């Protein structure tokens, strides 16, 4: 797709069911060592699911923060059609995702039986038997991300960065994240967008914050 087709697909997903945002501390490392290996495979014998990445769920009206401790990251807006390996409200292939937040579950219930199980290998019935509340459980399909975030989005309360483990393909990259208050973010996004357009992926700049998003011309 060209820039305008990705933007329209971006907005359509953002204003309906949502999609993913992945900030990166090193755009060059992300471009060279994640995106390019993915494209090499796609232009070769086929796309493969070797590289998994951390991302945040974003959706219109969901006052969600992204992971940017020093307020200086660029990032990728990634289609909701990306392979999902696990999602939680708080060197990887699927299976390593905890089914619940053990420490979070313990400070909620104080049930010391939580420590008898592996949170990466526990059944749905044992979690029930342990009384693990739903807000500390991971989910593993896109519709249940939507459900888990439905209540904060409707209330309009600000929420902390969430994490999903996704496997995105070049098809799925729809925009470049820009932090409007950070010169460093804009400089990094400027270089990342140029390098990706030169590969055939002309992407819009997307200023996301507070459940809202707007395209930009340059940064």
């Amino acid at each position: 797709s060209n820039r305008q087709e990705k933007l329209a697909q971006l907005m359509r997903q953002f204003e309906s069911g949502g999609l993913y945002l992945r900030t990166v501390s090193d755009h060059r490392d992300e471009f060279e060592n994640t995106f390019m290996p993915k494209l090499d495979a796609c232009l070769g014998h086929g796309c493969d699911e070797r590289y998994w990445s951390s991302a945040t769920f974003i959706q219109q009206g969901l006052n969600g923060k992204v992971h940017d401790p020093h307020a200086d990251r660029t990032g990728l807006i990634i289609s909701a059609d990306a392979r999902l390996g696990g999602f939680s409200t708080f060197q990887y292939f699927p299976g390593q995702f905890p089914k619940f937040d053990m420490m979070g579950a313990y400070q909620a219930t104080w049930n010391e039986d939580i420590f008898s199980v592996d949170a990466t290998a526990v059944s749905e019935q044992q979690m029930d038997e342990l009384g693990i509340p739903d807000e500390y459980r991971s989910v593993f399909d896109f519709d249940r991300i939507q459900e888990k975030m439905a209540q904060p989005r409707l209330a309009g309360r600000e929420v902390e960065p969430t994490e999903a483990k996704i496997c995105y393909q070049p098809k799925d990259v729809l925009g470049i994240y820009v932090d409007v208050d950070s010169p460093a973010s804009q400089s990094k996004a400027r270089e990342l967008q140029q390098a990706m357009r030169e590969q055939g992926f002309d992407l819009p700049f997307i200023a996301y914050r507070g459940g809202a998003a707007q395209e930009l011309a340059s940064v």
Partner: peptide, 9 residues
């Protein structure tokens, strides 16, 4: 002492 790491004691 309990030591927890990556969701297991």
């Amino acid at each position: 002492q309990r030591l927890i790491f990556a969701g297991k004691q």
